[PDB]
Ligand binder design. Structure first.
Ligand code: HEM
Ligand SMILES: O=C1N[C@@H](Cc2c[nH]c3cccc(F)c23)C(=O)N2CCC[C@@H]12
Length: 392
């Protein structure tokens, strides 16, 4: 009877999560709002760990055509394959991905990322009055991350196009079915025309390393660009927006980090636990009849895990709704878990850290409006406020 998602577009999670957690079963049935498909939803940490480490619950099978799904529309450019990451790992690109996303890449980029983040805060601190941390800080920083580390050199107009596509394609509601599908077609056709060129521009960005990988056609490249937009653009920008909100609402913790810069890493990891991002769930499909903490899951059925509900599980985390850097509980779910642990985790932790440090070097940064007055994009997969009015 319960339809999904829960329309908790702001940082205030839906009460339903705590409700499902407190229920009897470790999985609860819900119904997709966008398609009427029946779906299983996991909200408890213990269950989620079991589910995400059991590779018999498949991620790639969860998007074969005909799959039950939480999204109103198939999240691909029509005609195209999908699961670009499986396509890329299957083409023997793991080590390439390691170079473009791993500690080697972090090393290449951590210098400029931190420089950029400090310049943006500097420029903002040398103004009189208030300013918009979303537009004036997050947007250029996440834009530069996507450009410099993932796709290659983007113009302002190309950046705007892909950001619109992500905001239009990656929604539960607010756009027609055909608008949403059209966003993926737009992205696809942009990368069909440009992936080659973006690959060849200067720097050491992932898309170029993929193109120079021995084994990739324009089609394959285009599918890689789309995947990298979807996985790294609206995620990074959403997350940093929410992290800045979390930080500005916790001056005490900010002051602690100002006095103790060695506590910032623990702080980033608490941010990934505390700050919500996605409004939907990671999802997998039972590749056979399976049993989840006693619940029988039939082949073909799809099991969702809300990382938000799991990150806020009190059985796992003491005082789960409090911001506590240096807390010592289990591992957070902000990046998932298991074989599909976000490969973007190093670059995302890089940029997250650069941001937490720029803020902590400048105590007194605060909201210029009440948290309740912040305006949210409604219907997005990845939460993002319209603006973050802030000031010193
Ligand atoms: C440069 C930025 C990023 C890149 C390039 C990136 C890339 C990816 C890719 C390719 C996947 C698919 C892994 C797979 O299914 O095998 C993934 C998964 C994931 N990413 Fe990221 N990511 C980025 C940033 C982020 C951020 C900021 C978050 C914060 C929550 C995040 C959270 C996740 C999660 C939870 C998954 C797992 C989804 C699932 O298990 O179905 N990523 N990422
Ligand atoms: O809302 C969604 N979330 C992702 C998985 C996810 C959860 N939390 C995340 C944080 C960062 C990156 C992610 F991919 C996720 C997903 O499978 N979706 C399918 C339909 C709706 C969309």
């Amino acid at each position: 009877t319960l339809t999904y998602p829960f329309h908790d577009w702001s940082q205030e999670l839906s009460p339903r999560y705590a409700q499902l957690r407190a229920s009897d079963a470790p999985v609860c049935p819900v119904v997709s709002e966008g398609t009427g498909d029946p779906l299983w939803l996991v909200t408890r940490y213990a269950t989620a760990v079991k589910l995400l480490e059991d590779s018999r619950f498949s991620s790639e099978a969860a998007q074969a055509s005909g799959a039950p799904r939480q999204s109103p529309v198939e999240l691909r450019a029509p005609g195209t394959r999908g699961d670009a990451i499986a396509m890329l790992r299957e083409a023997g690109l793991r080590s390439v991905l390691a170079d473009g996303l791993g500690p080697r890449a972090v090393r290449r980029h951590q210098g400029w990322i931190n420089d950029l983040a400090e310049t943006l805060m500097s420029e903002l601190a040398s103004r009189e009055g208030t300013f918009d941390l979303a537009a004036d800080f997050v947007e250029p920083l996440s834009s530069a991350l996507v450009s410099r580390t993932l796709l290659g050199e983007l113009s302002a107009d190309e950046r705007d196009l892909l950001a619109h596509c992500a905001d239009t394609g990656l929604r539960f509601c607010g756009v027609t079915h055909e608008e949403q599908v059209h966003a993926f077609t737009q992205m696809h056709e942009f990368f069909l025309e440009h992936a080659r060129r973006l690959a060849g521009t200067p720097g050491e960005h992932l898309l170029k390393l993929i193109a120079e990988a021995p084994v990739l056609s324009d089609e394959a490249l285009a599918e890689a660009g789309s995947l990298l937009v979807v996985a790294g653009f609206p995620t990074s920008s959403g997350f940093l927006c929410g992290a800045l909100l979390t930080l500005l609402r916790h001056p005490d913790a900010v002051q602690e980090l100002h006095a103790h810069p060695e506590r910032v890493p623990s702080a980033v990891e608490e941010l990934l636990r505390y700050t919500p991002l996605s409004t939907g769930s990671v999802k997998r499909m039972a590749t056979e009849d399976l049993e989840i903490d006693g619940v029988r899951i039939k082949a073909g059925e799809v099991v969702m895990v809300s990382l938000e509900a799991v990150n806020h599980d009190p059985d796992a985390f003491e005082d789960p709704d409090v911001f506590r850097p240096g807390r010592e509980g289990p591992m957070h779910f902000g990046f998932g878990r298991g074989r599909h642990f976000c490969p973007g985790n190093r670059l995302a932790r890089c940029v997250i850290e650069a941001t937490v440090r720029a803020v902590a070097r400048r105590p007194g940064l605060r909201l210029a409006v009440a948290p309740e007055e912040i305006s949210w994009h409604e219907g997005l997969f990845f939460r993002r406020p319209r603006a973050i009015p802030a000031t010193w």
